[PDB]
Structures are given as structure tokens and as C-alpha cells.
Design a protein around this nucleic acid. Structure first.
Ligand SMILES: [Mg+2]
Ligand SMILES: [Mg+2]
Ligand SMILES: [Mg+2]
Ligand SMILES: [Mg+2]
Ligand SMILES: [Mg+2]
Ligand SMILES: [Mg+2]
Ligand SMILES: [Mg+2]
Ligand SMILES: [Mg+2]
Ligand SMILES: [Mg+2]
Ligand SMILES: [Mg+2]
Ligand SMILES: [Mg+2]
Ligand SMILES: [Mg+2]
Ligand SMILES: [Mg+2]
Ligand SMILES: [Mg+2]
Ligand SMILES: [Mg+2]
Ligand SMILES: [Mg+2]
Ligand SMILES: [Mg+2]
Ligand SMILES: [Mg+2]
Lengths: 66, 271, 70, 117, 103, 88
RNA sequence: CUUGAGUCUCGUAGAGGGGGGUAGAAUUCCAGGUGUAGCGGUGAAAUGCGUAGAGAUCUGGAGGAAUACCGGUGGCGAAGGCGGCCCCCUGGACGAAGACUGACGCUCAGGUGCGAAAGCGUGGGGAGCAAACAGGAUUAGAUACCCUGGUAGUCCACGCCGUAAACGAUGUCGACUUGGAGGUUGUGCCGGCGUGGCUUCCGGAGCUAACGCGUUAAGUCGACCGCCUGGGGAGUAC
């Protein structure tokens, strides 16, 4: 668990922070359920938005088979 | 605007009119007019060579600029006009040097709009550019088939072409017919669609409305005697033969294109 | 589930690694899920019933831990 | 004829059949075998054993190319996913990579209607 | 006057045009009486997946405070500039004057 | 909705002070401003039914406030509807 | 007069709505390369597809539709409903301090508006799916269930239709009346203690024919509306 973003006082998740976002995607590129990472729901939604934005900018892959 | 007529008389019950209040109500621009008298569909042998042509209203010809050759000089749309010679409306445009021209009215165009042709003209409806300067995917009309010859494709009301690909000296176009066609990328096209799209929604309502347009009645081949038409004859309503033209060519599916000279430019036919 | 066979790794071990990668990514479950169309009403009914059964089972377990069988 | 020494084994493992195609790394087929073409029909066609025999036969069909190393791409939910890879390994190929390439729509098209059996 | 975050990716074969692009876009913004709050030239990055068969692109990140109309003009510029292979314009609540995690 | 500036301007104009945000004239003027503004939105977005429900709520509340004002002080009511150009 | 109702200020979450753009996955089709005898399908088959080179695999292209994961007895909406990402326009809700108006309220026959899916009109579009339809099976038959195909339609614009087990089978508004465990979204103070909104499950009194409901009542009350009066005939006939 240990939702990191509340303990870091973030106001957003920042789609440009690929280091943080790689901790929330599986090796195939899928977004990890918050019931596994322990993320709070609000920050899970922020995280999903950020990952989708990063995927659009090709900073993250959609899958591992591009 | 598409407006139905009220059934105050049987010839009006089914009439559907296209009313465009934006169209100039006065006379057309006289220096761009010339007479064009009727043919009755007869050629210089005086023989009918295209049937069902005759009568209809007197019409003056409007000299329309299909070439759009006046590069780098802006023009402003003065007004839109009814043109009897074509389905599309036309626009009287005024160039900054004082010259006036008629152009095909694109969809959306209206009085006060600015237009321009040339290599550096902005990508805006009504602007005309060589197609090598127009983005792939764009919607265009009045497309040239040879550079400098003047637009010949997509001129009727509502029509347009899509620039689907560019390969070297050629672009591939999707014509309204569905045909995929190549022409040289130096050929000019005008951004946007031809206006007056509701033209096809009109309903003539009565026979006389076809007569006003210079269309004479069509007589069915099966209504004649054998001497007149392959379909002719029979005691009662008979047919019993494969449908043909008055001249005997099969007229239900038989193909007639034979132009080996232009086959190379057809990427795929319409189907 | 892309798997690279590491050096001096027996084949059966790497096959197991690939199998676990596939079972983790849920590829077979996704394929089976997508064989046929299930109406949204059926999907919602299935999800609701699964949640209800999960909750009822959990409560039965909690209240059986207070129950002596013999 | 041509010697390749580095190939890809594509295992199309459907519920009813298993197709094994061995290609070079550019995707050109060198030889193929199927569970359905290896003396198995109907119920026997869709078994791990029929897939194993198909893998053996496809390995035989590419002996002339001198292939030594195999990437393995598995596609589909069929019973021939694993036994095909085991048979390719027992055929003497050095399996250097195993990848699942099963197509997953990210929504995609509406599947056929549910069967009522 | 709204705050925007703009990222645009340039064809890697046009990287040396990026400085001129940056100055021109900044000029349009500032002529509209807008401000440049952040501006980062990330240079060439490897794409996470191919785009138009390319495996690289030149990223530029701008945080501006401009009226909507100049942003629409800029998006139209991005649309018709074949050097710009992708772009994203986002609204932000406030001006972001900081350093992105890419620097 | 109305911006802070337009709201404050209407409050100053129709209110008896810049703090008098609650008087019936201020409420009616704010509603009228938003209704007139939204005419342009709904001319373009004719199928925006969900927003139009909020617009019709604005119309209904304004009608109720006007009726209250007319029953309470008819002269104030007349002044208000003349300033804002309302039929009734 | 300010306690109901409402306005303003500052923020908060949200698949609320309308418009436009765009991304990646996949299906299908088209062109070509490699390759060769099968593929596909079922309970088993057959129809079908394939040596005129299919299926498999690789490359390039076209087009339509839907947005995996996130995703949740999670959220938003009056209901119907709403799910990639980005912008433009826009509705509602909620919280904290105040300030303001001063009963401006509740309900609502008739009226008006919205209203899933299917359907209808005109014009587009059409990948996938699929009423109808065709063939193959199954069977005593099989106008089905299963298989191979497949057209309306499903999609878009605009108009119509006005109905659903449109359901919580529970009208709206207000007040009051033991508890427990969660979810979600605010906010105050020092992970603890409060305090609001929405929400899931259990349960006490009470209520209920019983099943059950149980502070989100089907409990205790008030305001107003809708509706019922044995089964069938019939939500039919006129
Ligand atoms: Mg004729
Ligand atoms: Mg005729
Ligand atoms: Mg006769
Ligand atoms: Mg004859
Ligand atoms: Mg007869
Ligand atoms: Mg006969
Ligand atoms: Mg099937
Ligand atoms: Mg009523
Ligand atoms: Mg429908
Ligand atoms: Mg229709
Ligand atoms: Mg179809
Ligand atoms: Mg069927
Ligand atoms: Mg009913
Ligand atoms: Mg419902
Ligand atoms: Mg329900
Ligand atoms: Mg009911
Ligand atoms: Mg209970
Ligand atoms: Mg009836």
C-alpha cells in the first residue's frame, strides 16, 4: 500500500514524471490497479489521466508490442 | 433553404423549392456576360444528336474564372449570384487592383469574405493553390486535370474531391464518383466544397418545370413500334428481350469506357 | 508477455517464466472474455452478483470464526 | 538451399487447431505444420498431443535450412500453446525468447453473439 | 488570458529548425501580450513507439499565458507544419514557472 | 456562468450597495444577464438539453422573484422591468 | 423578524451536457513478399474457403466502429442515461468563513419539456455484428436452438415516434426516532480527535400477511398530487 502522493503533498501527478508513472504500470504497460499499489482513489484517477497523457506523447508505451 | 409548397393546385402539391435569400436579386455583372443560344440537341449537320433537349428559358452565359490564375492579389466577395448555366451558385469577386471576376461559390462563402490564389495563399475555403501546396487529406473542388488548363473536376453543387495521397509528381484524388484518380500535383484546386448542397433536395413537382429547364419528354422504347426501337412492338404490353439503347447496345450493366490513353491515371474505377 | 531466455537457464524454467508472465498479464482470461458479446445488462448483472457473493462469503467467514463446529 | 540459423516459430493456437509456421526473422515462411494436417481430425485435432506432433513435423520441414535458434511467438488460447514449445525445444532448437502476441482490442469490434447450447 | 502547457514534437531531421520555431511561437504569444512562463528544449528523445515510422522526435515544452485566440492560431500552425509530428495543448490552473522532471 | 467582474458590476449597479447581493433587483438582474448570455450558447447548441434545464431553472426563479417583487412593491417592480427590458 | 427559501465571495470532486480535434489496440478489405496443402467449424459433421495458391507469416495502404488496463455494491445526472486523450461552450452539486434579501415556500389537475432500445422519413456512411433470408446440420418434423454465409439495422445529420420488468416493481417536500462496519468527496484542530455532502452492507425499536423494511423506513407525523376496488372478457371494442 503506502499511497505515496499524499505523503509527498503533490497537487498533481505530472505526466512528465515518467520515473513515478513507471512504478504504476506493469511490464506490459498496463495501469496497475490501486488495490495492488494501495493508491488512494483520487490519486489513482490523477495517475490514470497522467499515464494516458504520457502514452499520447510517446513518453510511455501503450503495450509492449508496438 | 428547402421549402415545400402548399397544395393549392395539383401542380404545386409536390413542388419543393430551394430558396437562398443571400443570392443577389438584381442583374448580373454585365461585362462578364455573353449570349449562349440554344441547340435543340442538334449538331452542325442539323440532326438531333442528343435527344430530349429543347425549349426552356433564355439564358445568358456568365464567364466564370475556372483557372483562378490571379496569384498574389487579394479579392473580396461582393455578392453571390444565381447562375442559370450550372447547379452551383457563383460569386462576383473584386480584386484589389480593380478587376472583377466570377468564381464558383464554395460552401460557407459570403459577401465580404477574402480569397486568394497562388503558392503562398492560405489554406482557407475559396483559396486556390497548386495541389502540391495543399495538405494531403484536404477537401477541394474545381480541380485541374492539366496544369493551367482550368478546373474540370468537382464543379457541380455540393461536389468535392479529397486529396488522398501525394507520390512524386502526382497526387491521388478520390472523385465524387468514387473513382481513385491521379493528376499532376501542379494542377490547381480550390479549398472547400462547392456550395448549394441542397440543390439535390429540390422537387420539380410538375412536367412544366422540366420543360422550363429545356428538357423534352422521354418516350420509352417499349411504347414504340419495332421499326423505331429494338424494344418496340407487341400486342399488349410485351418485352421479351435484353434491354438496349435505341441503337441496340445493352443498357443494363454493359460497360462502354474504351480509352487506353488515360487508363494509366485511373487508380481504381468507381464500382 | 515478452520473455528473453537468460544465459545458462534450463528451458523448463524459462517456459515457466513465460507462463507466469502470461497468467499475470491475464491474456487467456481476456481472450475468453472477448469470444462472444455480452450485453451491458448481463455484464452489470455479473459484476453485481460477484460483489454480492464476495461480501456475503466474507461476512459468513467472519461470523463462522466465532462458531465452534464441535 | 539457403541457411538461416536464426528463426521464429509462430504458434497459432486456436481452440480447434494449432498451426506452426517457422519463419526467418524478417517474416518469410520456411515451413509449416498443423495439428489438423498431422493425422488428427475432430476431437483429436485440438489436443496438446496433436500440437506436439505438429511442432515436430514443422521442425522436420525446416531441417534443410539449418536453423539453430528460435524465437517463439504464441498467439491464441488453444491447448497447443505449451506442448508446441516443449516439442520445439526437444527438437534441438535453442529457444532464445518466448513472446505472447495474442491480439487484444483496446475497447474494437463487437464480438459474435453468445452461443445458446 | 489562460494558462496553457504546450508540448510539440518535431521531425528529428529538422532539429536545427527548432530554435526558429521557438522564437516565432514566443513572438506570436508575446505580441498577443502573453507571457512565457516556462520553456524547455528537451532535444531529441527516443519515442516509446514509432510515429510515422520515426523512432525519435525533438520535444519542446512551453508554459504560456495567452488569450484563447492566439492559442488556436498556434494549434493551426502546428496542424499545417509537417515538421511538427504531434502536439498537445493543456489548460493549467496557474502559471507553471519551475523545472520539469525532464531537466 | 457570469464572471466575477460582470457579477460585481451588476451588484453595484442594481444593489443599494456593493454588499447588497441579496436584494430582489440584484438577483433578477443577475439571472437576466445569464439568460441573455446563454441565448448565444443555445442558438449554437440546440441539443444541449441538460444545460437548458439549468437555463429554464433560471427563467423560473426569475419569474418567481419578479412576482414577489410586484406583490411587495409595484413601483420597484416597474422600474426593474423597464431597466432590464422584460415584458413582465 | 430570520430559523425555510434564495443571492454573493473563495475553493473542491465528478463517464453531467453540446461542439470540434486527435491517439493507440484490434477486426475487415486491398496490393505485394515468403511459403504449401490444407483451413474453418462442431457434440460429431457438413455447408463454406483453398493448388486460379488458401490458412499461417511479413510489409504497405483504405475504411468504419468502439475506447483494454485504470475500473471500484467508484463517480455524475431529474429520469432516460453518461467511460481513451485534448481544446471550446455550458448545467448542476458540495464545503468553509462571512455578508446580503426577508417567507420570496411546498405540492401540482390541465399544460409544457425531456425521455433506453426497436421503429419511421430524408440525406450520408457501413469495418464488425446481425432481425429477414439462403444453405449445412440436428430431428419424427425443426419454418428453431448449433454451423457457414448474410440484408435492413446498428453509425452520422436533421425531423418523427413517446414506449420498456422506463424497477427500489417504493410520488414529491419537510420534521422527528437506539446502533455497527465500510466507500467516496469536502473541511477544522492536534497518524489521533471532530464536522459536512453523497453512498454500500448489517441490524435495534417499531412496522409488516409474511417475506422483509429499518435515520437513504415499508418507523412516527404533516402538505399536496397520482392511482386501486374479484378473475377472465380487456388496456380489447367503439
Ligand atoms: Mg434523355
Ligand atoms: Mg423519365
Ligand atoms: Mg402503339
Ligand atoms: Mg428492330
Ligand atoms: Mg399479353
Ligand atoms: Mg411472356
Ligand atoms: Mg463462433
Ligand atoms: Mg400531467
Ligand atoms: Mg435507435
Ligand atoms: Mg434511418
Ligand atoms: Mg454491413
Ligand atoms: Mg447465425
Ligand atoms: Mg407503461
Ligand atoms: Mg433502467
Ligand atoms: Mg436498476
Ligand atoms: Mg411502475
Ligand atoms: Mg436491514
Ligand atoms: Mg389500444
Amino acid at each position: 500500500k503506502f499511497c505515496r502522493f499524499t505523503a509527498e503533498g503533490v497537487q498533481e501527478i505530472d505526466y512528465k514524471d515518467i520515473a513515478t508513472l513507471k512504478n504504476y504500470i506493469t511490464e506490459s504497460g498496463k495501469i496497475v490497479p490501486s488495490r495492488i499499489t494501495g493508491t488512494r482513489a483520487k490519486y489513482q484517477r490523477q495517475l490514470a489521466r497522467a499515464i494516458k497523457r504520457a502514452r499520447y506523447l510517446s513518453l510511455l508505451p501503450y503495450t509492449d508490442r508496438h | 433553404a428547402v421549402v415545400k409548397c402548399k397544395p393549392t393546385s395539383p401542380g404545386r402539391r409536390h413542388v419543393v423549392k430551394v430558396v437562398n435569400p443571400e443570392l443577389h436579386k438584381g442583374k448580373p455583372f454585365a461585362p462578364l456576360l455573353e449570349k449562349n443560344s440554344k441547340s435543340g440537341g442538334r449538331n452542325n449537320n442539323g440532326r438531333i444528336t442528343t435527344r430530349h433537349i429543347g425549349g426552356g428559358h433564355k439564358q445568358a452565359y456568365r464567364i466564370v474564372d475556372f483557372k483562378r490564375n490571379k496569384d498574389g492579389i487579394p479579392a473580396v466577395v461582393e455578392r453571390l449570384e444565381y447562375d442559370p448555366n450550372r447547379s452551383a451558385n457563383i460569386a462576383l469577386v473584386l480584386y484589389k487592383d480593380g478587376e472583377r471576376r466570377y468564381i464558383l461559390a464554395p460552401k460557407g462563402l459570403k459577401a465580404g469574405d477574402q480569397i486568394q490564389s497562388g503558392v503562398d495563399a492560405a489554406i482557407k475555403p475559396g483559396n486556390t493553390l497548386p495541389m502540391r501546396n495543399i495538405p494531403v487529406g484536404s477537401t477541394v473542388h474545381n480541380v485541374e486535370m492539366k496544369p493551367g488548363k482550368g478546373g474540370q473536376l468537382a464543379r457541380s453543387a455540393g461536389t468535392y474531391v479529397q486529396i488522398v495521397a501525394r507520390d512524386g509528381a502526382y497526387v491521388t484524388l478520390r472523385l465524387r464518383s468514387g473513382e481513385m484518380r491521379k493528376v499532376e500535383a501542379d494542377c490547381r484546386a480550390t479549398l472547400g466544397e462547392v456550395g448549394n448542397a441542397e440543390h439535390m433536395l429540390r422537387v420539380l413537382g410538375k412536367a412544366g418545370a422540366a420543360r422550363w429547364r429545356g428538357v423534352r419528354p422521354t418516350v420509352r422504347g417499349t411504347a414504340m413500334n419495332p421499326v423505331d426501337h429494338p424494344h418496340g412492338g407487341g400486342e399488349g404490353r410485351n418485352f421479351g428481350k435484353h434491354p438496349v439503347t435505341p441503337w441496340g447496345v445493352q443498357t443494363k450493366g454493359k460497360k462502354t469506357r474504351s480509352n487506353k490513353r488515360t487508363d494509366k491515371f485511373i487508380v481504381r474505377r468507381r464500382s | 508477455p515478452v520473455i528473453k531466455v537468460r544465459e545458462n537457464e534450463p528451458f523448463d524454467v524459462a517456459l515457466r517464466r513465460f507462463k507466469r508472465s502470461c497468467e499475470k498479464a491475464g491474456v487467456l482470461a481476456e481472450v475468453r472474455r472477448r469470444e462472444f458479446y455480452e450485453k451491458p445488462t448481463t455484464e452489470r448483472k455479473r459484476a453485481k452478483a460477484s460483489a454480492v457473493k464476495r461480501h456475503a462469503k466474507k461476512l459468513a467467514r467472519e461470523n463462522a470464526r466465532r462458531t465452534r463446529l464441535y | 538451399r539457403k541457411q538461416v540459423s536464426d528463426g521464429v516459430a509462430h504458434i497459432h493456437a486456436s481452440f480447434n487447431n494449432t498451426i506452426v509456421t517457422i519463419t526467418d526473422r524478417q517474416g518469410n515462411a520456411l515451413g509449416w505444420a498443423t495439428a489438423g494436417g498431422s493425422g488428427f481430425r475432430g476431437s483429436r485435432k485440438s489436443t496438446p498431443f496433436a500440437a506436439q506432433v505438429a511442432a515436430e513435423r514443422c521442425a522436420d520441414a525446416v531441417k534443410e535450412y539449418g536453423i539453430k535458434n528460435l524465437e517463439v511467438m504464441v498467439k491464441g488460447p488453444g491447448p497447443g500453446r505449451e506442448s508446441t514449445i516443449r516439442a520445439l525445444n526437444a527438437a534441438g532448437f535453442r529457444i532464445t525468447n518466448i513472446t505472447d502476441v495474442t491480439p487484444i482490442p483496446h475497447x474494437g469490434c463487437r464480438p459474435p453473439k453468445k452461443r445458446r447450447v | 488570458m489562460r494558462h496553457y502547457e504546450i508540448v510539440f514534437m518535431v521531425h528529428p531531421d529538422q532539429s536545427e529548425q527548432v530554435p526558429g520555431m521557438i522564437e516565432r511561437y514566443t513572438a506570436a504569444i508575446t505580441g498577443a501580450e502573453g507571457k512565457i512562463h516556462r520553456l524547455e528544449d528537451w532535444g531529441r528523445r527516443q519515442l516509446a513507439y514509432p510515429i510515422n515510422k520515426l523512432h525519435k522526435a525533438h520535444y519542446v515544452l512551453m508554459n504560456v499565458e495567452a488569450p484563447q485566440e492566439v492559442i488556436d492560431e498556434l494549434e493551426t500552425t502546428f496542424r499545417f507544419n509537417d515538421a511538427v509530428i504531434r502536439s498537445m495543448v493543456m489548460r493549467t490552473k496557474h502559471a507553471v514557472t519551475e523545472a520539469s522532471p525532464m531537466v | 456562468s457570469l464572471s466575477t467582474e460582470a457579477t460585481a458590476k451588476i451588484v453595484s449597479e442594481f444593489g443599494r450597495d456593493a454588499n447588497d447581493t441579496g436584494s430582489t433587483e440584484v438577483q433578477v438582474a443577475l439571472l437576466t444577464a445569464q439568460i441573455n448570455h446563454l441565448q448565444g450558447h443555445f442558438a449554437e447548441h440546440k441539443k444541449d438539453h441538460h444545460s437548458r434545464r439549468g437555463l429554464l431553472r433560471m427563467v423560473s426563479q426569475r419569474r418567481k422573484l419578479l412576482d414577489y417583487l410586484k406583490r411587495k412593491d409595484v413601483a420597484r417592480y416597474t422600474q426593474l422591468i423597464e431597466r432590464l427590458g422584460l415584458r413582465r
